[PDB]
């Protein structure tokens, strides 16, 4: 009864349709973010999910009161009766404001009219990716928010603390499979839209993809198939069906690895750093089969050496060369490939 | 300073009817539109649509909202848009769309002292495109957004792009992974129905598909599997197990390339440009294995009743015919 008429006095001459000080001054809305779980980063949609406790503090002059309580910890229904700044996400795609089991919003009013308004949000935000060094790349995923209707002359956003300490990521809530959150960078900007200039707060989450899955499923089958295609150099030259079955099948193996590993990626037009590795490893397997066709062209007989020993075929000079050359050149290429892209 | 502004807005809506079009018996109201596109998310060939995210904005003049004395532009809360008249503009391509609702419903009401009102929306829509994929993946596409009023005809409402050809912005900022926006157009026309003649605006893009994804995945192994079917012409005819096994493996690989690429693509009834190529390379693959059965039948079947000349002929002819096949193919569709 006592606290009801305090709240009813605040809503007598209050209009939630207009900004506090609509014709007098700007409205500073201090913002704070507590990231609970930096959720899974979808490569194919070029996006990332993030759960926050998005906090907003600002002073409203009309909500001054004098009562027993210094701060009023109130219901979320009154938050729909008070001016709330129309913050939107400049790169949000499909984001959820949770309401289980009640709308997850708290409104706290101090006795001088300073409002505290936090809400729990699941945000699916856009992250532009540069996959030229896939999978050994690192990129920044922005989280950018500002007012929707209110310009710089009306609503200015700020951070509650020093901006390096104004976005706090929780420790236990990682929720990442591939990437590795190295840290965040908090900055602030200004747009020039067709309706005016808007203050834009910005957080950049700096991710680095761990390459552990993409070595196991792509690189180690591609390396060991090149190691397969070099085993036929140690077979004899008279086994024409044995080396033909051997060589063409490892081309089919590299064909399967080419089209399957490209699927776990967007459909960009350039060649990723994994696609440079698969193309060259295909060329070692391609050249190993053309190596046998030169051996087969100069075989000059059809029978092999019986153990009791007529003239026989010598072990060819182009086979004794490719036992030394092609395993060495693949080892040199791995020194060139793995030092170029891991240094970046 | 501030309570006079509350008193002004409270008597703008005092006696306001949101069921009446502005000048309900008089001239039609002119609604000018302005689109600031954020992104184009996905362009699906299976679902035959595209996702468009845009800042969709509408100017019109309403004399019932005209205020006097206050020199500024009244930027009101988004909840007053439920208490005003707004146009019922829709999209015919619209499969599934939503106005964003985090952290609020992204509406804006900006009243001007002459009665002009801005109504801005941040809309992520999924507009449909029936795509002509007969030159896939070497083709240009045309995706359209069809803005039209629903319940007001051309005697009640009129549409115009605001700014001429500079109405829709943000098109140059769009970087798509496998397309390239060549040109966009702005079309204004009246579309007749049995109920009436309604005004329609049309934003329409031209999407030229980038081809570097398919040179890596589809064209380059189909070349090299076709080339490795030509190793059997440098192998003697006595090696029956060798020349058959590379010919059997090359007809298997062209099968597995076709089965992996039929899972990617929709149920088109025609033959695409990539299907002309994969079935085209399958002929040179399959003729390389019919060639050995032609050689094996002459020497071992019609023996007692040349064998080196047929191989020596086809060492030059089948690389020449396949290089001629790519010359016809890559100059027709490109």
């Amino acid at each position: 009864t006592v606290f009801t008429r305090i709240l009813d006095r605040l809503l007598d001459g209050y209009d939630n349709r207009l900004r506090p000080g609509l014709g007098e001054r700007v409205t500073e809305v201090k913002t704070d973010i507590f990231v609970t779980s930096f959720g899974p980063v979808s490569d194919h949609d070029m996006e990332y999910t993030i759960d926050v406790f998005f906090r907003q503090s600002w002073k409203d002059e009309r909500l001054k009161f004098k009562g027993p309580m210094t701060v009023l910890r109130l219901n979320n229904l009154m938050a729909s009766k008070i001016w709330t700044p129309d913050t939107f996400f400049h790169n949000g795609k499909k984001s959820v404001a949770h309401n289980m089991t009640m709308p997850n919003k708290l409104l706290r009013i101090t006795e001088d009219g300073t409002l505290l308004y936090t809400m729990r949000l699941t945000v699916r935000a856009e992250c532009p990716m540069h996959l030229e060094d896939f999978p050994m790349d690192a990129h920044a995923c922005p989280l950018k928010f500002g007012s929707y209707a209110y310009t710089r002359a009306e609503v200015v956003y700020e951070w509650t603390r020093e901006p390096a300490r104004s976005v706090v990521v929780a420790e236990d809530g990682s929720r990442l499979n591939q990437y590795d959150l190295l840290g965040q960078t908090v900055d602030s900007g200004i747009v020039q839209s067709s309706t005016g200039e808007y203050v834009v707060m910005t957080t950049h989450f700096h991710l680095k993809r761990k390459i552990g899955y993409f070595v196991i499923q792509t690189y180690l089958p591609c390396i060991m198939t090149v190691i397969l295609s070099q085993v036929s150099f140690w077979l004899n030259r008279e086994s024409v069906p044995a080396r033909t079955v051997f060589g063409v099948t490892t081309v089919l193996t590299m064909t399967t690895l080419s089209i399957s590993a490209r699927n776990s990626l967007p459909k960009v037009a350039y060649a990723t750093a994994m696609d440079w590795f698969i193309a060259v490893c295909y060329a070692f397997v391609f050249s190993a089969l053309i190596e046998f066709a030169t051996v087969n062209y100069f075989t000059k007989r059809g029978y092999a050496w019986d153990g009791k020993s007529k003239t026989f075929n010598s072990v060819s000079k182009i086979d004794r060369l490719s036992r030394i050359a092609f395993p060495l050149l693949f080892g040199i290429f791995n020194l060139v490939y793995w030092a170029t892209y891991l240094n970046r | 300073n501030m309570s006079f502004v509350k008193e002004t807005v409270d008597k703008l809506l005092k006696g306001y009817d949101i069921r009446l079009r502005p000048d309900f018996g008089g001239p039609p109201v002119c609604v000018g539109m302005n689109i600031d596109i954020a992104s184009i998310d996905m362009v699906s060939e299976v679902n035959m649509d595209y996702t468009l995210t845009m800042y969709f904005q509408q100017y019109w003049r309403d004399k019932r909202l005209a205020y006097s004395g206050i020199p500024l532009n009244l930027t009101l809360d988004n909840r007053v848009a439920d208490q005003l008249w707004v146009p019922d503009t829709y999209f015919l391509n619209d499969k599934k769309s939503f106005v964003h609702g985090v952290t609020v419903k992204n509406r804006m009401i900006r009243l001007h002292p002459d009665g002009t009102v801005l109504y801005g929306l941040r809309i992520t829509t999924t507009a449909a495109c029936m795509m002509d994929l007969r030159r896939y993946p070497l083709d240009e596409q045309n995706c359209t957004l069809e803005i039209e009023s629903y319940g007001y005809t051309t005697d009640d409402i009129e549409f115009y792009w605001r700014g001429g050809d500079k109405a829709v912005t943000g098109v140059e900022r769009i970087e798509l992974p496998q397309f390239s926006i060549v040109e966009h157009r702005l079309v204004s026309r009246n579309v007749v129905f049995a109920t009436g003649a309604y005004p329609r605006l049309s934003l329409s893009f031209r999407l030229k598909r980038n081809i570097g994804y398919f040179i890596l995945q589809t064209y380059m192994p189909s070349i090299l599997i076709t080339i490795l079917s030509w190793v059997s012409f440098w192998i003697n005819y006595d090696a029956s197990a060798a020349r058959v096994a590379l010919g059997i493996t090359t007809v298997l690989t062209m099968t597995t390339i076709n089965t992996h690429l039929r899972e990617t693509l929709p149920k088109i009834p025609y033959v695409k440009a990539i299907d002309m190529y994969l079935m085209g390379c399958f002929v040179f693959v399959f003729l390389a294995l019919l060639e050995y059965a032609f050689v094996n039948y002459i020497f071992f079947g019609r023996g007692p009743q040349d064998v080196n000349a047929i191989d020596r002929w086809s060492r030059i002819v089948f690389p020449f015919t396949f290089s001629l096949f790519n010359l016809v193919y890559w100059l027709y569709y490109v």
Partner: nanobody
Amino acid sequence: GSLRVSCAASGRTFTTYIMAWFRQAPGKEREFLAAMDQGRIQYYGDSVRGRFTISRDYAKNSVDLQLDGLRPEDTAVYYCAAGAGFWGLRTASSYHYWGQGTQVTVSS
């Protein structure tokens, strides 16, 4: 007197990248001046917020720094950078494409 330093790009479309302006006084100090995101968001340095205005042209693939109110302390070499900023938008080591420099001299 005002000035407008321009930076035309070639060889790569920098629509998805971030193109930025730097300053280096005699004394070997690369200083951040301005940057613009893909979504047209202007990041300014602390000593220059309000004076210098950045404006990109996404069709011509260029970035333009509008120089307004040139005090004589801004006599330095202005560099044009273009990167995807990783630990960036203020760090010079997050821009892997560079201009050659422009000696902008303000005389008192």
